Write a protein that binds this ligand. Structure first.
Ligand SMILES: *[C@@H]1O[C@H](CO)[C@@H](O[C@@H]2O[C@H](CO)[C@@H](O)[C@H](O)[C@H]2NC(C)=O)[C@H](O)[C@H]1NC(C)=O
Ligand SMILES: *[C@@H]1O[C@H](CO)[C@@H](O[C@@H]2O[C@H](CO)[C@@H](O)[C@H](O)[C@H]2NC(C)=O)[C@H](O)[C@H]1NC(C)=O
Ligand SMILES: *[C@@H]1O[C@H](CO)[C@@H](O[C@@H]2O[C@H](CO)[C@@H](O)[C@H](O)[C@H]2NC(C)=O)[C@H](O)[C@H]1NC(C)=O
Ligand SMILES: *[C@@H]1O[C@H](CO)[C@@H](O[C@@H]2O[C@H](CO)[C@@H](O)[C@H](O)[C@H]2NC(C)=O)[C@H](O)[C@H]1NC(C)=O
Ligand SMILES: *[C@@H]1O[C@H](CO)[C@@H](O[C@@H]2O[C@H](CO)[C@@H](O)[C@H](O)[C@H]2NC(C)=O)[C@H](O)[C@H]1NC(C)=O
Ligand SMILES: *[C@@H]1O[C@H](CO)[C@@H](O[C@@H]2O[C@H](CO)[C@@H](O)[C@H](O)[C@H]2NC(C)=O)[C@H](O)[C@H]1NC(C)=O
Ligand SMILES: *[C@@H]1O[C@H](CO)[C@@H](O[C@@H]2O[C@H](CO)[C@@H](O)[C@H](O)[C@H]2NC(C)=O)[C@H](O)[C@H]1NC(C)=O
Ligand SMILES: *[C@@H]1O[C@H](CO)[C@@H](O[C@@H]2O[C@H](CO)[C@@H](O)[C@H](O)[C@H]2NC(C)=O)[C@H](O)[C@H]1NC(C)=O
Ligand SMILES: [Zn+2]
Ligand SMILES: [Zn+2]
Lengths: 902, 6, 902, 6
């Protein structure tokens, strides 16, 4: 009985067939500095059920249509009812056309409108972006429709399943270039009413979703290539970026990635061209618009001269991720936002596969484990987590839709899909994947459709046998939150599962239909030899001889952490794994060498092993040369450093880390020919970066020596930076720490003239490493000056200063003191008080510091705390948990480091 | 979308 | 009508003639750990006026006399009245003997008592002192009567004018030594009631004051010498101290100092022997008991191997000071405590003369200027100051008497007496001094008696002419507080005086009978040539051509700062003095090179010159080799460092000081033959100490180099410390700052085994120089542990940590956090919250820090703040004054240092 | 006395 225009979901009575859309951005503002765009559209739709109302989305559009807000016509010889009135309903973002009679099923109608909106600098819908070319401020027009902003650019049935073809036309200044999803139909032609403008028409899109449309007017230039099949590939950027060669790496990898996916998906790339564009400051990162993918510049462009290898890794993975969607997400589209996790989780997994194809020597696939698996496990091991799936009827408003785009959706999505591919086998997974894409091309699906297609492939073969249906298995991993710890007693081979929470005193109140039991694929290795695969059924406890060991035998579960779970053992089997790692580490796969560390520190947090057992698992690192296990140790120990770097625990901690890292430092010293040439592949470059960072930050004299020499050498010849980009962040930081105002002032001058964001970021970060109080305070004083520190870098800089053990009280005092830069930083920018608060309070671990934080909060009465309001409550609760952890752990940890630092 | 999405 | 026993001053009706006193300390406590002494005394006194009451002092004595508390007899054939009753009146510290009839004028009486008191560890009266000899705890008995504690050891007429002879006997364990003012009469004899004890009788003292008595029972040993006139000189100390040779320097200087004073005073040393004794932890410093001077050990003993030159200076000056009193104070005694300033001020001046005699190459006399003159001017340039003189009738209670012993009495006393000697001439001063001592030997005086004798010498010659009587001149300097700034306009030769206050907004409410006008002796030098002497009369303004300059001429007043005043000039004459100092500094006496600095920074504080003019007066220091002017700069600038060392001002400040000190550092480097041999005389050694300290603390790479090399060398050979004691405090501190836990732990081990207080102090101080937060916090954690840091060193150590710019917030947090070590540190020791508060809050100069301090004070409700209660109010007011000064000065000072650091 | 006196 509620009126349909007060419901958030569209009626199903009318479905779109095709749209004409003409947009005209005005890149010169009016007298008051208002920028607008104008548009005209015609939507052709079909009546499925009789209705006397048309409901279509519209947001922030003013209508200038002759008569009512629309004109309505019948297609062919269909009669059309007269319009009664048109109204806009802001809450549900609709244009509502009330008719004097009913539309008729089977008939098609055309609805024409003319409209205009602000071309705002708001990164939503059709919007403007401003950037500098030297003396000059440039302004371009571009789009971001995802999720519910297509309706902010033209009236449309703005739900992803309501697919249609689109004929786009841009009217633009005649010396600019216009781009959209499809190629232009031909040359631009002059606008007859004013030939300073031109008209660019684009070929008709395939049937597609509104959230994937894009159109862009700019001065950008491209580098290009024509693939063997005739697909034109272009990378677009600012003219100066193109001329500097910054588009080349993206161009290099794009062809191979597209080829890999066409093969992987058993489906031709569905469009005639691929454009990718680098936009200055695009806050969303990247967006997979079909045929015209947008990226933040620094994510797509690459400067070999000044960029690190991790930087390069980001380019190729971000590209692989977006290109993945050109089939999965765009060709076959999930019917509703509640299934976003499947689209984003799938892309978040297969980005590693596409990237690996482009860079096959880098072993990129391994990176999903620290990058996504352990990352998301940190938040999925909380009582406040949520299942991957959400009922569709609970996801209605644009705010509810936006909440779907979180860590769980992307990273747990990737993790469980990777698991599924693995227990299926890739070949079988790819077979059902192809079957799904072929059956649903240009249509819409739910996750159940993918499971059904995977089930079809399973049922068509005899080799891979499952303990249940694909759906029943995946239901355990998608309908309930969290994941299990699998615990093995190797004396008996008994194996158990329970819902893993980091906080052992947590009360879980979200109920599960499965009582937090999973069906779990368990690979295992015994004395370095793969064993037969095992499935744990939906039981708390089971037994198998696979997990039963002889006294000199060791067993280890979840090879390469393909399964979304963590593993604990009895202490004896732990000691055996330890012995192995100490005596021949190569017998255990590198990812599992990392797993042992990752898992045991989490288990210690949850009180399932002693903290000393986790520490014991780092003892092998003195002989470890590879990236991942060292990364596991460093990630798991940053909290220890945060908690203890002001205490008597720190001496022995640093001493221990120096001992462990010295042989690695030495190794690279020789391997790199005295640091003159980098290791060859990515993982080894990453290992070297970490080794140097660890050596320097823990006070290894030989690392300090290297940093001073290199920075001294740079200062004596500023135009020839002798420091490879991989090593800059450490070398800069350590040399600044060791030096005084000469190094600091030099780095400041370098910062002030840096042209490249990444180099500027490293300098800003390294400037916070000074051990002079006065330089840190002077630096803090600069953070609020937009002439010296960009406002968008202010909080990040303060946090870097806070990270310095000496800068901790300076930053904290500065923040409390200047808190009333909130009455000048909520309505004129965001700032991010939230991140600032977290950063500056991160160390707090005493009742004394807790009392201070409470007293600061007592500037309540007015001022409040805007967008980090509770980023302050979180700080109080975090500090309490820190006080408690430090109290339980201080003694034990102290004595362990003393005991193990020689 | 990838990065900061809504 | 008030009863005389309720008045604080004794009657004048009875005067003592002579005393017998026998004291017996019991160095073994009873079962409950109570130590006592027993005594018996007989006082013979004469009746001047009839009275039926005897009032004598007694404090904390229990009487065990047969009958009443005393027995009273007539001398010779005098009848005596019967006693009615005896009572003790605690408030006024009297024993009151009420008689049944009157004593008769002209008659002598003997009053006998037997008594006992606690031999407490309270440093007052006859008291015990505990110290270790290895495994063993030793206990000795010693005395401190000054001011009103003779009455705590035996009943006596305990006022300094009531002089008498004393026959002392000590009853003591037979294997210990007994000492008193006079030599023993002969060998000790066994106590017949228990021959484990012996009896030592001493020769009769001269007529003397009760506050100068002493007697000591100990295991101490001596080194000795017999002077040419037969006076036996001995230095007494712990057996181990004597055997290590620590008594030798004191012995070396004592003979020459006694000879100098006998000549200076034109009066033979009035006793047959001189004993001086080094007591462990004697909190009063030194006490001039006639024939038996007591010192804190570390003030009398000297270890050449480990002691600095400043250390040596302290020994010889402290000895000269105490020996000075053996005539001035002890032979002629001021009648009442209100004239304490004359006794202590005189000794505080002539200590430099006696010491100079013993060390004639050291130029010690100059040291009174920074040591006493400018020191006391800091507190005498306050509205809250007080005149040297106090009416005798306002000084009654023991607390009122104790207030006489302050900085004004000692240091302004010294300053004005030095002035007086100078304008008289030493020869004439010495003539009246002799006349005074000869006229009043064994009697009592007031300051007016000295003036009268000086006037007699003036009147007996024709050379020195004064503008008024000695008394009228000295009245200006003794009856009103403070001192004038003398201001000269050299264009006209106009000269003015006004009462100088550091705070130009201060209201002076203490009235002066002279309207804060003085009669002022003014020496002057013009273009490096002495001019005729001038006296400014009691006028605000005068004119003389002595002070009128030609445009290229300069004039400078108060040669060697013999006058107790500061001097300002017009800017032109300042610039001329500056030019001179830059072009040939040697034309201006070294003390005046310092004066220009001292005076101008004070004038800047009081807003009489710009702060940049004071700074301008340091520009000459790059060519200055001598101690004093550099000391003036360093003293005047420590506040600038305190205020600015966390701010953007510090870089340019350090840069400026590096520039100024480098040529001096270089000079000593060559002069000392690469730091292998010290400069010859004291002032140059002091200059070298300061140069190194300044170079190192301001970051001169060559100083840091030296410190690291020397400490590295020490660490490689711990038993052979290669660092001369003069340089240790800097070298230790800088090397610890540069290093990490290796240097810190090494210095900590050295501290834990140090046998010598002075070396332990330097280590404790240097340990606070670490630039590692964690080491400073670990160190702070040690301060409350008596096993690691003596309680008496706790607050001092925390303050050293606070002095470290990095240790500032750590110490402040520690103090606030641990403040509830007040409910464990007021009744079990003092601690000195006062000094702690001052030290930790010293830096505060922002509204933010002021708010923190207020919030800390808000742990008011209970706990309070004991003995530093207001040392907290002072902190609030000081911080406000700091906020204000920093606000007015920051910009100007910043730009001056930038401008002058090249 | 000299030093800390009363
Ligand atoms: C859309 O229409 C609205 C309302 O007509 C415009 O907003 C108004 O602008 C006027 C004049 O600039 C101001 O007085 C008001 O602030 C606005 N009125 C209301 C009711 O909000 C808006 O600018 C139009 N937008 C475009 C792109 O043309
Ligand atoms: C894009 O690919 C090309 C071709 O493989 C890479 O070109 C090489 O660049 C390196 C580094 O300067 C030179 O050693 C070679 O001479 C180049 N090879 C060829 C065939 O030209 C290029 O480096 C790639 N761009 C990026 C950013 O990775
Ligand atoms: C889709 O996959 C199919 C099935 O595997 C591919 O077709 C096979 O291609 C190979 C290549 O020579 C032939 O030998 C097989 O006989 C083919 N099988 C069938 C059933 O035709 C096909 O090439 C893939 N298509 C795309 C577009 O990738
Ligand atoms: C959403 O997707 C479904 C497919 O999963 C579409 O339904 C199919 O439509 C095709 C071709 O138009 C028919 O041949 C099939 O029989 C349909 N399959 C069904 C109903 O399961 C559906 O049309 C899409 N929804 C919208 C609004 O386009
Ligand atoms: C002096 O006399 C007083 C009082 O007779 C003694 O102090 C008393 O000691 C007793 C027993 O030790 C305790 O009950 C009390 O604490 C004290 N009583 C009073 C009234 O204070 C004191 O010890 C005597 N002193 C000496 C040196 O003999
Ligand atoms: C006490 O005086 C003596 C005699 O003047 C000083 O003795 C000299 O000591 C130095 C330093 O070791 C040697 O160079 C000389 O050989 C000694 N001279 C004589 C005559 O023995 C002694 O140093 C003085 N003590 C102190 C602590 O200053
Ligand atoms: C006290 O000072 C007097 C007076 O100056 C000293 O006596 C003089 O001593 C010299 C030494 O030879 C004689 O030449 C003079 O004739 C003496 N004058 C008189 C008046 O006697 C005396 O030596 C000093 N006494 C002491 C104890 O220091
Ligand atoms: C305090 O000192 C004065 C001297 O300033 C003493 O008075 C003198 O006593 C002597 C010798 O005993 C007489 O010959 C003088 O005539 C006195 N001079 C005077 C009275 O000015 C006085 O006795 C001392 N007071 C005490 C209590 O001893
Ligand atoms: Zn994506
Ligand atoms: Zn004295």
């Amino acid at each position: 009985q509620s009126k349909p225009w007060n419901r958030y979901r569209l009626p199903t009575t009318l479905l779109p067939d095709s749209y004409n859309v003409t947009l005209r951005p005005y890149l010169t503002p009016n007298a008051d500095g208002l920028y607008i765009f104008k548009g005209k559209s015609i939507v052709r739709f079909l009546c499925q059920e009789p209705t006397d109302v048309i409901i279509i989305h519209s947001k922030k559009l003013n209508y200038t249509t002759q008569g009512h807000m629309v004109v309505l016509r019948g297609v062919g010889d269909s009669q059309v009812p007269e319009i009664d009135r048109t109204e806009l309903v802001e809450l549900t973002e609709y244009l509502v056309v009330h008719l004097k009679g009913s539309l008729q099923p089977g008939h098609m109608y055309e609805m024409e409108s003319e409209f205009q909106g602000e071309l705002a600098d708001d990164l939503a819908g059709f919007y403007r972006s401003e950037y500098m070319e030297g003396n000059v401020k440039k302004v371009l027009a571009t789009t971001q429709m995802q999720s519910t902003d297509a309706r902010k650019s033209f009236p449309c049935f703005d739900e992803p399943a309501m697919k249609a073809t689109f004929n786009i036309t841009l009217i633009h200044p005649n010396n600019l270039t216009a781009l959209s999803n499809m190629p232009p139909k031909g040359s631009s032609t002059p606008l007859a009413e004013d030939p300073n403008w031109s008209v660019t028409e684009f070929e008709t899109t395939p049937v597609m979703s509104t959230y994937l449309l894009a159109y862009i007017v700019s001065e950008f230039q491209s580098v290009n290539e024509t693939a063997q099949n005739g697909v034109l590939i272009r990378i677009w950027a600012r003219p100066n970026a193109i001329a500097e060669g910054h588009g080349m790496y993206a161009l290099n990898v794009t062809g191979p990635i597209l080829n890999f996916f066409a093969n992987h998906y058993n489906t031709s790339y569905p469009l005639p061209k691929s454009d990718q564009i680098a936009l200055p400051d695009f806050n969303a990162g990247a967006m997979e618009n079909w045929g015209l993918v947008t990226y933040r510049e620094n994510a797509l462009l690459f400067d070999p001269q000044s960029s690190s290898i991790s930087n390069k890794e980001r380019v190729v993975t971000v590209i692989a991720h977006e290109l993945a969607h050109q089939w999965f997400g765009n060709l076959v589209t999930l019917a509703w936002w509640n299934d976003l996790w499947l689209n984003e989780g799938f892309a978040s997994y297969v980005e590693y596969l596409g990237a690996d194809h482009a860079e096959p020597t880098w072993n990129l696939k391994d990176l999903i484990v620290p990058g996504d698996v352990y990352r998301v496990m940190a938040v999925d091991a909380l009582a406040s987590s949520h299942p991957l799936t959400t009922p569709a009827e609970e996801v209605n408003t644009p705010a509810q839709i936006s909440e779907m785009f979180d860590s769980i959706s992307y990273s747990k999505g990737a993790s469980v899909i990777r698991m599924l591919s693995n227990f299926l086998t890739e070949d079988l997974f790819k077979e059902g994947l192809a079957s799904y894409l072929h059956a649903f091309a240009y249509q819409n699906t739910t996750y159940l459709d993918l499971w059904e297609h995977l089930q079809k492939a399973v049922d068509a073969q005899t080799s891979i046998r499952l303990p249940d249906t694909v759906r029943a298995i995946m239901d355990r991993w998608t309908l309930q939150m969290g994941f299990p710890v699998i615990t093995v007693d190797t004396k008996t081979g008994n194996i158990s599962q329970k819902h893993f929470l980091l906080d052992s005193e947590s009360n879980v109140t979200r109920s599960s239909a499965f009582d937090y039991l999973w069906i779990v694929p368990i690979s295992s290795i015994k004395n370095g030899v793969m064993q037969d695969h095992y499935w744990l059924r939906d039981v708390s406890q089971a037994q198998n001889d696979l997990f039963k060991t002889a006294s000199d035998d060791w067993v280890l579960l979840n090879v390469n952490v393909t399964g979304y779970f963590q593993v604990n053992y009895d202490e004896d089997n732990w000691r055996m794994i330890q012995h192995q790692l100490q005596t021949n580490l190569s017998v255990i796969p590198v990812i599992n060498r990392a797993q042992v560390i990752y898992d045991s520190f989490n288990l210690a947090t949850a009180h399932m092993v002693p903290v000393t057992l986790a520490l014991d698992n780092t003892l092998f690192l003195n002989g470890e040369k590879e990236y991942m296990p060292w990364q596991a140790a460093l990630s798991s120990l940053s909290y220890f450093s945060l908690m203890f770097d002001r205490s008597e625990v720190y001496g022995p901690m640093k001493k221990y880390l120096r001992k462990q890292v010295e042989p690695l430092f030495q190794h690279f010293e020789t391997l790199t020919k005295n640091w003159t040439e980098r290791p060859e592949n990515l993982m080894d470059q990453y290992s070297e970066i970490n080794a140097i960072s660890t050596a320097c930050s823990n006070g290894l004299p030989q690392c300090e020596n290297l940093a001073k020499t290199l920075f001294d050498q740079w200062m004596s010849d500023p135009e020839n930076n002798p420091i490879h980009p991989n090593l800059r962040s450490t070398i800069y930081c350590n040399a600044i720490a060791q030096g005084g105002q000469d190094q600091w002032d030099f780095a400041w001058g370098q910062l002030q003239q840096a042209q490249l964001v990444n180099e500027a970021d490293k300098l800003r970060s390294a400037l916070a490493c000074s051990n002079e109080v006065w330089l840190l305070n002077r630096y803090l004083g600069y953070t609020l000056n937009p002439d010296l520190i960009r406002k968008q870098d202010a909080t990040s800089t303060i946090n870097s200063i806070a990270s310095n053990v000496i800068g901790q009280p300076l930053a904290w005092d500065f923040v409390q003191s200047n808190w009333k830069k909130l009455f000048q930083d909520y309505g004129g920018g965001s700032f991010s008080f939230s991140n600032l608060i977290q950063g500056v309070t991160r160390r707090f671990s005493s009742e004394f510091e807790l009392q201070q934080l409470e007293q600061f909060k007592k500037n309540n009465m007015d001022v409040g705390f805007g967008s980090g309001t509770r980023a302050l409550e979180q700080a109080l609760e975090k500090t309490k948990a820190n006080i408690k952890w430090v109290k339980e752990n201080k003694e034990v940890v102290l004595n362990w480091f003393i005991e193990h630092s020689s | 979308c990838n990065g900061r999405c809504g």
